Enzyme design. Structure first.
Site, PDB file in Angstrom:
ATOM      1  N   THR A   1      49.179 -33.591  26.025  1.00  0.00           N
ATOM      2  CA  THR A   1      49.434 -35.000  25.597  1.00  0.00           C
ATOM      3  C   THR A   1      48.543 -35.093  24.362  1.00  0.00           C
ATOM      4  OG1 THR A   1      49.780 -36.037  27.721  1.00  0.00           O
ATOM      5  CG2 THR A   1      48.664 -37.408  26.193  1.00  0.00           C
ATOM      6  N   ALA A  49      49.719 -37.290  35.370  1.00  0.00           N
ATOM      7  CA  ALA A  49      50.487 -38.519  35.161  1.00  0.00           C
ATOM      8  C   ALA A  49      50.214 -39.552  36.255  1.00  0.00           C
ATOM      9  CB  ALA A  49      51.975 -38.213  35.091  1.00  0.00           C
TER      10      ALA A  49
HETATM   11  C1  LIG Z   1      51.780 -33.992  28.027  1.00  0.00           C
HETATM   12  C2  LIG Z   1      50.312 -33.804  28.433  1.00  0.00           C
HETATM   13  C3  LIG Z   1      49.606 -32.954  27.306  1.00  0.00           C
HETATM   14  O1  LIG Z   1      50.287 -32.951  29.592  1.00  0.00           O
HETATM   15  C4  LIG Z   1      49.668 -35.181  28.826  1.00  0.00           C
HETATM   16  O2  LIG Z   1      48.337 -34.984  29.330  1.00  0.00           O
HETATM   17  C5  LIG Z   1      50.488 -35.919  29.920  1.00  0.00           C
HETATM   18  C6  LIG Z   1      49.994 -37.382  30.129  1.00  0.00           C
HETATM   19  C7  LIG Z   1      50.734 -38.132  31.262  1.00  0.00           C
HETATM   20  C8  LIG Z   1      52.260 -38.188  31.046  1.00  0.00           C
HETATM   21  C9  LIG Z   1      50.155 -39.555  31.353  1.00  0.00           C
HETATM   22  N1  LIG Z   1      50.362 -35.217  31.187  1.00  0.00           N
HETATM   23  C10 LIG Z   1      51.389 -34.622  31.803  1.00  0.00           C
HETATM   24  O3  LIG Z   1      52.544 -34.574  31.381  1.00  0.00           O
HETATM   25  C11 LIG Z   1      51.016 -33.994  33.131  1.00  0.00           C
HETATM   26  C12 LIG Z   1      50.402 -32.610  32.928  1.00  0.00           C
HETATM   27  C13 LIG Z   1      49.854 -32.216  34.140  1.00  0.00           C
HETATM   28  C14 LIG Z   1      50.653 -31.592  35.096  1.00  0.00           C
HETATM   29  C15 LIG Z   1      50.113 -31.209  36.320  1.00  0.00           C
HETATM   30  C16 LIG Z   1      48.764 -31.471  36.587  1.00  0.00           C
HETATM   31  C17 LIG Z   1      47.960 -32.103  35.633  1.00  0.00           C
HETATM   32  C18 LIG Z   1      48.511 -32.474  34.409  1.00  0.00           C
HETATM   33  N2  LIG Z   1      52.244 -33.918  33.918  1.00  0.00           N
HETATM   34  C19 LIG Z   1      52.340 -34.387  35.180  1.00  0.00           C
HETATM   35  O4  LIG Z   1      51.438 -34.905  35.833  1.00  0.00           O
HETATM   36  C20 LIG Z   1      53.728 -34.205  35.745  1.00  0.00           C
HETATM   37  C21 LIG Z   1      54.574 -35.409  35.347  1.00  0.00           C
HETATM   38  C22 LIG Z   1      56.010 -35.279  35.888  1.00  0.00           C
HETATM   39  C23 LIG Z   1      56.666 -33.998  35.376  1.00  0.00           C
HETATM   40  C24 LIG Z   1      56.810 -36.529  35.471  1.00  0.00           C
HETATM   41  N3  LIG Z   1      53.760 -34.060  37.193  1.00  0.00           N
HETATM   42  C25 LIG Z   1      53.710 -32.852  37.765  1.00  0.00           C
HETATM   43  O5  LIG Z   1      53.600 -31.785  37.154  1.00  0.00           O
HETATM   44  C26 LIG Z   1      53.905 -32.882  39.274  1.00  0.00           C
HETATM   45  C27 LIG Z   1      52.676 -33.333  40.059  1.00  0.00           C
HETATM   46  C28 LIG Z   1      51.517 -32.371  39.852  1.00  0.00           C
HETATM   47  C29 LIG Z   1      50.535 -32.572  40.802  1.00  0.00           C
HETATM   48  C30 LIG Z   1      50.761 -32.173  42.122  1.00  0.00           C
HETATM   49  C31 LIG Z   1      49.765 -32.341  43.072  1.00  0.00           C
HETATM   50  C32 LIG Z   1      48.545 -32.906  42.697  1.00  0.00           C
HETATM   51  C33 LIG Z   1      48.324 -33.296  41.375  1.00  0.00           C
HETATM   52  C34 LIG Z   1      49.316 -33.129  40.424  1.00  0.00           C
HETATM   53  N4  LIG Z   1      54.314 -31.551  39.716  1.00  0.00           N
HETATM   54  C35 LIG Z   1      55.578 -31.231  39.951  1.00  0.00           C
HETATM   55  O6  LIG Z   1      56.520 -32.024  39.864  1.00  0.00           O
HETATM   56  C36 LIG Z   1      55.743 -29.756  40.386  1.00  0.00           C
HETATM   57  N5  LIG Z   1      56.923 -29.053  39.832  1.00  0.00           N
HETATM   58  C37 LIG Z   1      58.092 -29.325  40.653  1.00  0.00           C
HETATM   59  C38 LIG Z   1      59.347 -28.576  40.148  1.00  0.00           C
HETATM   60  O7  LIG Z   1      59.565 -28.890  38.755  1.00  0.00           O
HETATM   61  C39 LIG Z   1      58.413 -28.496  37.976  1.00  0.00           C
HETATM   62  C40 LIG Z   1      57.216 -29.335  38.403  1.00  0.00           C
END
Ligand SMILES: *C[C@@](C)(O)[C@](*)(O)[C@H](CC(C)C)NC(=O)[C@H](Cc1ccccc1)NC(=O)[C@H](CC(C)C)NC(=O)[C@H](CCc1ccccc1)NC(=O)CN1CCOCC1
Ligand SMILES: *C[C@@](C)(O)[C@](*)(O)[C@H](CC(C)C)NC(=O)[C@H](Cc1ccccc1)NC(=O)[C@H](CC(C)C)NC(=O)[C@H](CCc1ccccc1)NC(=O)CN1CCOCC1
Ligand SMILES: *C[C@@](C)(O)[C@](*)(O)[C@H](CC(C)C)NC(=O)[C@H](Cc1ccccc1)NC(=O)[C@H](CC(C)C)NC(=O)[C@H](CCc1ccccc1)NC(=O)CN1CCOCC1
Ligand SMILES: [Mg+2]
Ligand SMILES: [Mg+2]
Ligand SMILES: [Mg+2]
EC number: 3.4.25.1
Lengths: 212, 222, 125, 204, 195, 226, 196, 233, 195
Positions: A1, A49
């Site tokens: 991000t 997120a």
């Molecule tokens: C873009 C950026 C640089 O990463 C920026 O920091 C953004 C800011 C947000 C949108 C406010 N962050 C993200 O996009 C995060 C990056 C991240 C991923 C995982 C852990 C920490 C940071 N993205 C997400 O949190 C992500 C958003 C969804 C895709 C809308 N969610 C996941 O990846 C999700 C939960 C992860 C998780 C699980 C358990 C505990 C904590 C976190 N994981 C999944 O959906 C797993 N997987 C399922 C099959 O498809 C692929 C993803």
């Protein structure tokens, strides 16, 4: 991000990208990474997120309770410290958060606080946070002065996020802009990178690395 | 060592129209290379004109839907039979998911319905409860196959007006229910061809002001 | 129990002749006649089955040999030398061509490979 | 760590009526850092086109290797190599590195000069051949490309229609992958004319 | 070795390389030149694992100098970069690979053009208007994306490079002890002694 | 993959599905898994796709040279022996699991071979991810003294069981029949029970929909005269 | 796998079950684990199917070449060739082999070669996963100089029990009889041996 | 977290026109040792439900006691315990499914796969699966373990979809189940010849069959199989 | 947090603490004050894990300020250091220990003496004429062993401190962005604004 906030003559500029990823999968290009806590307070989101959305929404509730109890707007210092003390309780449990709490109060003036999930809380004039922070810093630090016009400062913030959107694989989508004054925050629009990049290339004569 | 999670496959798809919304899901349920069932319903009418699906690990999915259905029941009891709006349902689901932040529900959740202005609404959730409203979303095993197609055909991405060089985008339009169902059926036919975990049947739930209607279509069984 | 013949046994004589090649050509002259004719829609190759004894089964001795499904070979000269060359020609059609390109070599290139093997016996130790 | 997704990138190929199309993105990166926006992944040896995704050092190495081999082929055979034959050569060359492979996803595309028949093929990193009638996909957004192609494609498209289909398949697949994009190139190939087009796409 | 930068302007290529050599706890040296002249119009800067960097750079230097004597001719920058790439691509599948990243800045006397090649330890080659290895590029590429034009002078290129170094001195954690700057043009290679 | 072999009165039949996969994605819907070793020795392949192709082609090449050397038609036991010794040497690393069948002057034969180099003899065999589904059908309907028609039916039914019930298998049934005193008959796409339905919509775009920056002709021809 | 070889008055008899397993799946239910290395020298195979086949093929080759040069090899010699391969390649092999043969001079002989590659000459031998369950039974019921019918019954009853308790053993009971009279193959189906 | 010790293999089942059939062999394995030969793994609950259990036998015996206690508890203060308020298959299943998922969620599962077969009050067929993870599903045929891989393909040839259920008689359905049990005895290394079978019909009620054996086995072709390739004798 | 130094002279205690705050790749701030006033004549500097440092420092500050109000009296430096040590010694056997190292510089108004205490995260307390935490002491202790005298003035103490900082700026790999210097004497605590 990529997220950034900076202080200048005419207040605070806050700019963020709109991309969410799951590894290399681009989950969304339309995420809101700014939370409007009250008319004088903004929160920026980077990291997990859910962690960011949940706890910054929760922060909004705690700020609302403060003003009901104390009959007064919460300070930026106090609001940031509620969030930093909360994440500190959860330290080691694996929360992922990089945030800026930006706002104006009469007693403080325009104020920016960096808060993250390992417990760090810092006051400062300039911050860039996220995977693309280095790219934003590169543009921002070179063209930064205290006394930019509001128009020039808004552009620099927009341009710094654009720079990071281009180079950082995990940043992009669109640019959301905010300007914080004495009178509160003002939204300055959503700017899709797919149109903004080409506009900026032509008008500025930058991005000569690209085939255009 | 005991592993508390599993993968039951399957794929789901939400599309929001002007005065309607659809939530579609395949009816196949799998573990590894075995088929458990060719018809195991995955998309559910939850009451208050809200449809829900929690695709991924089926036990966590069933648990979440069951808890949300119960949340709707207790919302009626505690607030004088008031209709749970789609935005309010979404925020409630975030808290259900984030409640298990350190032992997550292994699912991707989509809900669909109408907002308080009668316009079509689709909300989308990650496993730990981050959410967003969208015109489009696919979830599950073949999401990576289906979503780019929806970006192109629902939101008209990378499409321009012919003869304008490349400076006027194709203008955004709401699609008719007939047009949406065509896109849903082609999405799942395509996904079934290329993803082994997708097949057997397609069940679509359509939400309008009049209520919740169902349509079923056969998919390839290999 | 050593191969000490690391030097050429075919060398240039003062007149510029390669003696062993000339002498090999003389051995070919003594050999039984064989011919080849090319038509518009085909090619024919032919030779005499010179039987060493009437008790011998001349069917078992194949002077005309398949190299690939579309390529055939006949000779004049020393029969054992021909037999080992057919073995090597069949193998090199696979190793240096079919296992690379998934198809049999064209006539000219298989010929080129056989030619190479015969050149090496004219220069190697 | 995973060599197939350090640099990123994609290639797609499609058949049409008396034509083929092959296309690729222009990105080269070091994981999150975008480095180059001019790194083309499609090469040609006479009238046979080869796209290569994967580890960029191996993309460059294999281009140089197949240029080497097809140059020698032409000198000896006295004709240009055909797509069917070149496909077998790619397979042979990959499989000889079975236990220390090139981390690549090659794609062959072209028209056989004698029969006039459109031809495409794809390979895994150790040389298995997928000879498709319809389309071939490769790279970090292969899932995305499979989805786009499987829905957008119809057989017997005219060259100028096939251009629109393959371009939209590439662009929309790239926009759902962090490690693909940064520009794109499309080759439209007919029996004796080849048109190359650079696509305008989002630069993030 | 930490920061190496390169920028190609109108009529020259400028390479900037950090002076620090650090082993663990201590900065052993603050005046280290992380470059070798390969030929009169071709300069290679380098960074990576201790030992490997210099050994590789001097090995390439010896080979290009050998070629120059044999043919009485200077290889083009493109030709030198392709030779270097092949050596690294060979190296990566060895028993012990060279952990060395390089920039090659050259002036092609035939085409009358400056050229800058970025090559990593895997043998990944790209020709670029500006380049960097390691963590430097995370700060410097965005800057150059903003400020670079192809028709810039050498003086404008040096000012643009000062803006890169200032940013790295502000935001990077390690003290890299400034940079040695070298310009490659039609007249050869020279060092900017005051930077 | 689902592959089977079934012996009958005067020969042997082999069959296979036509799906190849890459992770959970179907890479090819009409894959050909029946490989010809020699004209009357064919085999069905399962496992690592590149390995099965390479191993059949290598042994098929050496079998052809052996046939020319000995002036004899190749034997199934020779293909078997050469395959197992090659696979044993590579200690399972060459991931080829094969059903080897054929007719030769000795008679009709049916074998299976596994990647580690073990072989087995049988009247009916199955291999691949769908081998359990196929073996269930074979164990329920196989009998001694099957006719040609009965063996083709049983073999394809056994593949169908794999197609429908195993996610690793799908699409079409390929068959090859090898009968004593006859040419081997390869029946490509013997069954086609998985044609895609017509799509609801055509996705053909209007011409000019995609934005272009530059056009140019590519020179594919050699350097020209004059 | 359950395998055994038993010397008796007129010679020796080899016995085995017919099960081959991949995990808990039965890959082959009609396996032949009794393999010929020479006219009247046979072996029982247990352990890896690939390894024991490879070894047995090499031993058959060595004894064919021995026969061409030196005439019929002894059972001891056949056992020595098995040993050499099992011992020298102990790090890379999983093979438990019983070697059994008939000479006219030495009569019936049995040699067992376990995992290490040691050799042990014995009046009878048992091996394979299922053998653990019949050590007690076999020790109590074995006698020297039994008749052919007694030795067939001893093996049938023994392997019946091994099959009953071991999930890795099953199918038919195959036997091979080695005497002066020649080589006889016997088979016994589940309906016969289960009711014993 | 534990590991299963004494284990039961496949349970197989299907729907037919008027009811359901379920079957399971009588073995309790101790790894590769076929330790216990008289273990009943079909457990009836009332006259309308049979619960077939595979996996850990100690956990099966626990579940058996839970079901026995459930019948006792349902009878308490219930004058219609043998009529309108009798336990249904759907009630028994949901109870087990709740327990299974609760136990997995405490990281201490009941190491089993369970099929509840029965007939409801209104005559409707009930057939549903649940396992150690709490995963549940229904289908016209259901099977656990090896039965999923080998029995389902055979049983699906009889009932491939919902519309085939009315066309399938009890004789055809039982025949298919008995054949499937034979196939499992040929091919599953942790199976036995002896098994139990239960039919729950809407008209004729619960029929529970004990001490069944796999019969009509084909082993004769084994005599003709010699060596592993080249051996001729 | 990186470098914290302390030196006790004749009539005062001087604490020097680095201004840099670095997270991973970026220097987030270059003006960070790594200290808290515990009482009017007692200053605590700190360094260690992110979050833990400030949380611990402010927690100690609150407790000493609470004591000051309750008794209307300032605890001696020795008493404050013993309180801090016990809190850290308690912490080390907790579920999640405080990863924080501290220096406590105080002027004892009763004895009319400056005092410097060095305490690490384990609760290891020592009174010293000069002290440092982390990698700083590897360079600075040898200097102070050479140049220190007990009867030095505050100005001589500041010059001796400049010599420490110059050495750290020469030989340490990280850019710590200079130091904030604070003097603790009979008149209280003041910050040296130009250093
Ligand atoms: C873009 C950026 C640089 O990463 C920026 O920091 C953004 C800011 C947000 C949108 C406010 N962050 C993200 O996009 C995060 C990056 C991240 C991923 C995982 C852990 C920490 C940071 N993205 C997400 O949190 C992500 C958003 C969804 C895709 C809308 N969610 C996941 O990846 C999700 C939960 C992860 C998780 C699980 C358990 C505990 C904590 C976190 N994981 C999944 O959906 C797993 N997987 C399922 C099959 O498809 C692929 C993803
Ligand atoms: C499908 C089936 C039911 O399993 C059946 O057995 C068929 C039979 C073949 C067609 C004769 N088997 C396959 O389709 C195999 C299954 C398999 C996959 C992976 C390992 C072993 C077996 N599929 C392939 O071999 C596949 C063919 C391509 C799609 C044409 N190749 C791969 O999946 C390839 C294997 C690489 C490999 C390397 C070393 C040892 C073993 C295998 N893997 C990839 O392409 C994965 N990845 C590589 C980097 O780029 C992205 C993709
Ligand atoms: C049945 C018996 C008691 O074990 C008896 O000894 C027989 C005797 C043979 C028929 C001469 N042995 C077997 O059936 C072996 C048992 C065994 C398994 C593994 C290692 C050693 C012995 N079975 C096989 O050899 C089996 C034959 C195939 C099915 C034709 N091969 C394997 O199971 C294979 C062996 C790999 C191996 C080889 C050597 C050392 C270690 C491992 N293993 C697999 O394919 C593993 N399998 C596990 C489940 O997922 C699929 C892959
Ligand atoms: Mg980007
Ligand atoms: Mg299938
Ligand atoms: Mg992208």
């Amino acid at each position: 991000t990529t997220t950034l906030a900076f202080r200048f003559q005419g207040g605070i500029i806050v700019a963020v990208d709109s991309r969410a990823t799951a590894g290399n999968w681009v989950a969304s290009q339309t995420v809101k990474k700014v939370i409007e806590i009250n008319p004088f307070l903004l929160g920026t989101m980077a990291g997990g997120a859910a962690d960011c959305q949940f706890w910054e929404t929760w922060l909004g509730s705690q700020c609302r309770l403060h003003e009901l109890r104390e009959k007064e707007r919460i300070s930026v210092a106090a609001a940031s410290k509620i969030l930093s003390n909360l994440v500190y309780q959860y330290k080691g449990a694996g929360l992922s958060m990089g945030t800026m709490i930006c706002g104006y109060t009469r007693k403080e003036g325009p104020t920016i606080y960096y808060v993250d999930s390992d417990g760090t809380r810092l006051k400062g004039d300039i911050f860039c946070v996220g995977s693309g922070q280095t790219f934003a810093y590169g543009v921002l630090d070179s063209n930064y002065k205290w006394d930019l016009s509001v128009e020039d400062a808004l552009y620099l913030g927009k341009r710094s996020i654009l720079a990071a959107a281009h180079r950082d694989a995990y940043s992009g989508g669109s640019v959301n802009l905010y300007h914080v004054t004495e009178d509160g925050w003002i939204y300055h629009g959503n700017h899709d990178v797919g149109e903004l990049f080409w506009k900026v290339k032509e008008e500025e004569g930058s991005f000569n690395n690209v085939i255009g | 060592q005991f592993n508390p999670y599993g993968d039951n496959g399957g794929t789901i798809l939400g599309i929001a129209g002007e005065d309607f919304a659809v939530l579609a899901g395949d009816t196949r349920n799998i573990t590894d290379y075995s088929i458990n069932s060719r018809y195991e319903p995955k998309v559910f009418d939850c009451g208050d004109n809200i449809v829900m699906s929690a695709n991924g690990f089926a036990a966590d999915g069933d648990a979440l839907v069951k808890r949300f259905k119960n949340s709707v029941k207790w919302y009626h009891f505690d607030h004088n039979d008031k209709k749970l709006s789609i935005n309010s349902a979404a925020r409630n689901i975030q808290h259900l998911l984030y409640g298990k932040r350190f032992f997550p529900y292994y699912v991707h959740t989509i809900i669909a319905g109408l907002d308080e202005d009668g316009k079509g609404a689709v909300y989308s959730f990650d496993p730990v409860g981050s959410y967003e409203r969208e015109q489009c979303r696919a979830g599950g095993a073949a999401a990576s196959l289906i979503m780019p197609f929806l970006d192109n055909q629902v939101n008209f991405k990378n499409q321009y007006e012919p003869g304008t060089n490349g400076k006027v985008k194709k203008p955004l339009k709401y699609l008719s229910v007939e047009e949406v169902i065509k896109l849903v059926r082609d999405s799942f036919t395509s996904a079934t061809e290329r993803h082994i975990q997708v097949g057997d049947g397609l069940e679509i739930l359509i939400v309008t002001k009049d209520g919740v209607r169902k349509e079923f279509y056969e998919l390839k069984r290999d | 129990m050593t191969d000490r013949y690391s030097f050429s046994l075919t060398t240039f004589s003062p007149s510029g002749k390669l003696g062993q090649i000339d002498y090999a050509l003389t051995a070919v002259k003594q050999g039984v006649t064989s011919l080849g004719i090319k038509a518009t829609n085909g090619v024919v190759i032919a030779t005499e089955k010179k039987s060493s004894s009437p008790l011998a089964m001349s069917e078992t001795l194949s002077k005309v040999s398949l190299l690939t499904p579309d390529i055939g070979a006949v000779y004049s000269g020393m029969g054992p030398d021909y037999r080992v060359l057919v073995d090597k020609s069949r193998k090199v059609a696979h190793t240096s061509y079919k296992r690379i390109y998934g198809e049999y070599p064209p006539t000219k290139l298989l010929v080129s490979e056989v030619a190479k093997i015969m050149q090496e016996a004219t220069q190697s130790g | 760590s995973d060599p197939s997704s350090i640099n990123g990138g994609i290639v797609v190929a499609m058949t049409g009526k008396d034509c083929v199309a092959i296309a690729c993105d222009l990105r080269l990166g070091s994981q999150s850092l975008g480095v180059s926006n001019k790194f083309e992944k499609i090469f040609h040896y006479g009238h046979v086109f080869l796209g290569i995704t994967g580890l960029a050092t191996d993309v460059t190495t294999l281009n140089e290797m197949f240029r080497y081999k097809t140059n020698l082929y032409k000198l000896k055979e006295e004709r240009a190599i055909e797509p069917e034959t070149f496909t077998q050569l790619v397979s042979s060359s990959l499989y000889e590195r079975r236990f220390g492979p090139y981390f690549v996803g090659p794609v062959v595309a072209g028209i056989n000069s004698k029969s006039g028949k459109p031809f495409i093929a794809g390979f895994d990193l150790i040389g298995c051949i997928d000879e498709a009638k319809d389309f071939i996909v490769s790279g970090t957004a292969s899932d995305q490309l499979f989805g786009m192609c499987e829905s957008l494609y119809e057989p017997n498209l005219e060259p100028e229609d096939l251009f629109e289909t393959i371009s939209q398949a590439l662009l929309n697949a790239a926009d759902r992958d962090a490690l693909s994009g940064w520009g794109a190139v499309v080759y439209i190939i007919k029996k004796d004319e080849v048109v190359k087009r650079y696509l305008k796409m989002r630069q993030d | 070795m930490d920061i190496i930068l390169g920028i190609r302007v109108q009529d020259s290529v400028i390479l900037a390389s950090s002076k620090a050599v650090t082993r663990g706890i201590s900065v052993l040296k603050d005046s280290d030149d992380k470059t070798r002249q390969l030929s009169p119009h071709t300069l290679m800067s380098f960074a990576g694992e201790a030992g490997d960097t210099v050994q590789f750079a001097e090995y390439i230097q010896a080979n290009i100098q050998l070629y120059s004597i044999r043919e009485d001719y200077e290889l083009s920058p493109q030709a030198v970069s392709s030779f270097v790439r092949q050596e690294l691509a060979k190296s990566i599948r060895s028993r012990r690979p060279y952990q060395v990243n390089v920039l090659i800045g050259g002036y092609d006397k035939k085409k009358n053009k400056p050229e800058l090649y970025q090559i990593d330890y895997l043998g990944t080659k790209v020709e670029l208007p500006y380049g960097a290895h390691g963590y430097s590029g995370f700060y410097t590429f965005s800057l150059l994306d903003h400020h670079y034009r192809p028709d810039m002078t050498t003086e404008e290129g040096l000012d643009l490079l000062k803006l890169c170094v200032q940013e790295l001195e502000k935001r990077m954690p390690m003290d890299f002890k400034g940079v040695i700057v070298k310009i490659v043009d039609k007249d050869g290679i020279r060092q900017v002694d005051d930077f | 993959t689902t592959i089977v072999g079934v012996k009958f009165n005067n020969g042997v039949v082999i069959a296979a599905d036509t799906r190849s996969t890459q992770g959970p994605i179907v890479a090819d819907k009409n894959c050909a898994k029946l490989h010809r070793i020699s004209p009357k020795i064919w085999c069905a392949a399962a496992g690592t796709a590149a390995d099965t192709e390479a191993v059949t082609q290598l042994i098929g090449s050496n079998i052809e040279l052996h046939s020319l050397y000995t002036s004899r038609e190749p034997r199934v036991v020779s293909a078997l022996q050469m395959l197992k010794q090659h696979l044993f040497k590579y200690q399972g690393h060459i991931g080829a699991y094969l059903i080897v069948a054929g007719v030769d002057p000795t008679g009709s034969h049916l074998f299976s071979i596994h990647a580690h180099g073990s072989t087995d003899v049988g009247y009916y065999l199955s291999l691949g991810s769908g081998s359990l589904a196929a073996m269930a059908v074979l164990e329920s309907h196989w009998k001694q003294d099957l006719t040609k028609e009965e063996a083709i039916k049983l073999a394809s039914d056994a593949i169908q069981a794999g197609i429908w019930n195993d996610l690793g298998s799908g699409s079409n049934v390929d068959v090859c029949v090898m009968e004593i005193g006859k040419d081997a008959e390869y029946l490509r796409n013997y069954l086609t029970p998985n044609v895609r339905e017509e799509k609801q919509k055509s996705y053909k775009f209007p011409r000019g929909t995609t934005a272009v920056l530059k056009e140019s002709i590519v020179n594919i021809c050699d350097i020209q005269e004059e | 796998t359950s395998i055994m070889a038993v010397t008796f008055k007129d010679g020796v008899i080899l016995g085995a079950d017919s099960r081959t397993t991949t995990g808990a799946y039965i890959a082959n239910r009609v396996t032949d684990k009794l393999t010929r290395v020479h006219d009247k020298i046979w072996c029982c195979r247990s352990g890896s199917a690939a390894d024991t086949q490879a070894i047995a093929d090499i031993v058959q080759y060595h004894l064919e070449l021995y026969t061409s040069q030196y005439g019929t090899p002894s059972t001891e010699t056949a056992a020595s060739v098995f040993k050499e391969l099992c011992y020298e390649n102990k790090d890379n092999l999983t093979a438990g082999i019983i070697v059994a043969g008939y000479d006219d001079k030495n009569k019936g002989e049995v040699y067992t070669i376990p995992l290490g590659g040691s050799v042990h000459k014995l009046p009878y031998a048992i091996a394979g996963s299922g053998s653990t369950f019949i050590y007690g039974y076999c020790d109590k019921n074995f006698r020297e100089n039994m008749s052919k019918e007694e030795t067939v019954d001893f093996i049938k009853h023994s392997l019946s029990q091994a099959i009953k308790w071991d999930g890795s053993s099953g199918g038919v009971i195959r036997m091979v009889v080695l005497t002066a009279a020649g080589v006889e193959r016997l088979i016994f189906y589940p309906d016969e041996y289960e009711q014993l | 977290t534990q590991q299963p010790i004494v284990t039961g293999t496949s349970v197989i089942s299907m729907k037919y026109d008027n009811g359901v059939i379920i079957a399971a062999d009588n073995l309790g394995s101790y790894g590769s040792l076929l330790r216990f030969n008289g273990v009943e793994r079909l457990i009836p609950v009332g006259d309308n439900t049979v619960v077939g259990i595979s996996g850990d036998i100690s956990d099966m015996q626990h579940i058996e006691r839970l079901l026995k206690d459930l019948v006792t508890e349902n009878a308490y203060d219930n004058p219609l315990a043998d009529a309108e308020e009798a336990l249904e298959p759907s009630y028994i299943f949901e109870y087990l499914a709740t327990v299974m998922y609760q136990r997995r969620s405490k990281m201490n599962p009941l190491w089993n796969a369970i099929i509840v077969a029965g007939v409801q009050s209104n005559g409707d067929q009930f057939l549903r699966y649940v396992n150690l993870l709490g995963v549940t599903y229904s289908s016209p045929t259901l099977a656990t373990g090896f039965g999923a891989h080998m029995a389902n393909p055979l049983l699906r040839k009889v009932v491939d979809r919902e519309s085939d259920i009315p066309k399938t008689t009890v004789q055809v359905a039982e025949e298919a189940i008995v054949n499937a049990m034979r196939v499992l005895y040929y091919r599953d290394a942790r199976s036995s010849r002896n098994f139990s079978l239960a039919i729950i019909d809407k008209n004729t009620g619960l029929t529970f069959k004990k001490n069944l054996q796999v019969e009509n086995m084909k082993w004769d072709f084994a005599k003709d199989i010699k060596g592993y390739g080249t051996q001729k004798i």
